[PDB]
Amino acid sequence: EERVINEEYKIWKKNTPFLYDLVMTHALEWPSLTAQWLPDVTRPEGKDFSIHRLVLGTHTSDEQNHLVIASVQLPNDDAQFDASVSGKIEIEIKINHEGEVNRARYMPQNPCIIATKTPSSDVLVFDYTKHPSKPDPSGECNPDLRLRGHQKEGYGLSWNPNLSGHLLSASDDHTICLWDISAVPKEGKVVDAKTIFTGHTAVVEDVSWHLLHESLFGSVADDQKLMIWDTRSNNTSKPSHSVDAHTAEVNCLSFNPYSEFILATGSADKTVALWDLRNLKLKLHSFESHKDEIFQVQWSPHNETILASSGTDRRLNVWDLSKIGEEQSEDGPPELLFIHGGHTAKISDFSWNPNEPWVICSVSEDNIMQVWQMAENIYN
Amino acid sequence: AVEERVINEEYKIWKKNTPFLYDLVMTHALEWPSLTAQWLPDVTRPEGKDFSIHRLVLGTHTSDEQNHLVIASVQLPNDDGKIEIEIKINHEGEVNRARYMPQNPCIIATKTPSSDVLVFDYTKHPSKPDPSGECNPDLRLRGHQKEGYGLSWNPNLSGHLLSASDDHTICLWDISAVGKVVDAKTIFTGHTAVVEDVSWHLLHESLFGSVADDQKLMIWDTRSNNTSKPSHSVDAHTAEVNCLSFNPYSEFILATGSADKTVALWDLRNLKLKLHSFESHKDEIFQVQWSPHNETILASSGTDRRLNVWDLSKIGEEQSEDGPPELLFIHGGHTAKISDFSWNPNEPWVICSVSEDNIMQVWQMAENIYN
């Protein structure tokens, strides 16, 4: 209850100046379920800040829902007082959306193309450069593509970084869907799944492509299993490997962007399991610190041994896996590098800034979005 | 004179004639009769199989008790199947009508017999309903004193809902407000008898039209400061007017359906003169829908257990007869009064229709008929 949780926020807040190099907060008109930075930074020559953009969404009680792009002023190399002349966050564009945005993810090869998960099971594809910044007041949603294959809403979504146009989606209907929208002109058309992998027997929580092997991807589901899939394989009902990853629901995974054999998964058993693709009968490690469910996990895009996780315990943990086995005086395992206690509600999503190391955006259920960055002496 | 089930004779004859009347007749017996029928916008065609997936929003109509809002999925054969239920949602009484919101098809608004207008989001309820029978709607819309049928979402203003009613009133909601109770933004008191149907105009956010047992067509504008008097007034029929439907392509053309068995064509630009009267039904008419594919195609249904399909371009053509020239097809598949029907938005000429004897038919007339 917000009783003790508030005591800790009062304490957290008073402590931020030398726990962080930057805390920015912004309250959204509606809560976002999804958060991902766009790769492209803009930096005017005159000013001493640079402009990044996020892909956010809405989750309303009713009303109208929108796909959102937001701009963030991030310092370059001044000094000032950082997060407290205070750098601004604005909405750059809303696009009418059929129901809440379960997730929004841009395409690595063309960052204008954005895919969203709707609750009507539909996956939609937008080019936001083809919609006005001010949404049509009719409230009607006009996607450039409509991807069909699912029966139920979902969350998991993943573009293939080495195969342009190939999109995978995960769902409550127990299925994974592949679309190849490559030869597909993006002007409204309906496209049906190329392939549907039926391995799992419960709700599929997430799926992600391997980052260097085009054929490989992995999904996780509420059936407590991590499955590694191959598209070469003609069998879509049984994946190449299968693991019992956790003792409760498996809600996310994220392949290591520097190390081709390493992935991690996040669950409802309050843990993050480190995995080695070369041998799945052995969990490498179990990061234990969260006190409630885990719903998101991301590798740092800068440093190969940094990992983050977030979920219901209203906290975002940042892990360093090289400090496995190190001795202590403890207040948690040595691999636990930082506890971000900035949110006073369950966190829905976070995403590392791809251009600004250690800068993280994170959003929670009480419409609070935080752009923040831990102080440098913590990782030096 | 009772015992007259002459109905059965003609169903026997009809069935024997389908091979040369339809490209597709599907029949299904519903667990209770459905009062309502509407296709959902979404078509799925799985990359392997020889059928496509469509879905309906149906309701139940029980006899004490337990009703459900129903989502059924329908498998339709391709150029080169069977119908099942996707999810039941507990409902306070019969579903007089179910209508999804265009801006969010997850959203469905229903009319109950209990005064209330309810708003559901079916993605927020179990596929397996709570056996308690309890109804927990996401919104409770208040304004009416009596049940109604007419219902219509605004295609050009997200979230705005119109309802028609027996209390003689029409109510407006924009649900973008605050247990889960929202009050009418506006109440249009124009009609003097039961209001039978209400529908938004398809391009103009401001205009809508209603029909009532006082035999009247009234056209409303929402900017108007007077909620006691509409922009126009027509004596539409020589009896009750039960439904209306604006032409999805011609902004001045609408149609009305009446207890007088006629379908009245109207021109908004001059309502003093009736454009046409489609005469062929042998009893009351309760539903009328424009085909969403062809600008000159219209369908109607009712008590005479039939569904007439009209093409209004063959109005005036010479013939030797057994009915008007504009009469394109008579669907005689039901052995009871038809409650509602719905054009398939993706498969041209395919129509769903539901009757008082729990029969749901997904069907399509033969192609040589409309060429």
């Binding site: 959204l28 989750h59 309303t60 009303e63 969350y155 469910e293 259920e365 | 993605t123 309820h125």
Partner: peptide, 12 residues
């Protein structure tokens, strides 16, 4: 319905 998505979000 998931245990990831709230039942009733609030407007600010």
């Amino acid at each position: 319905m998931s245990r990831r998505k709230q039942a009733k979000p609030q407007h600010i």
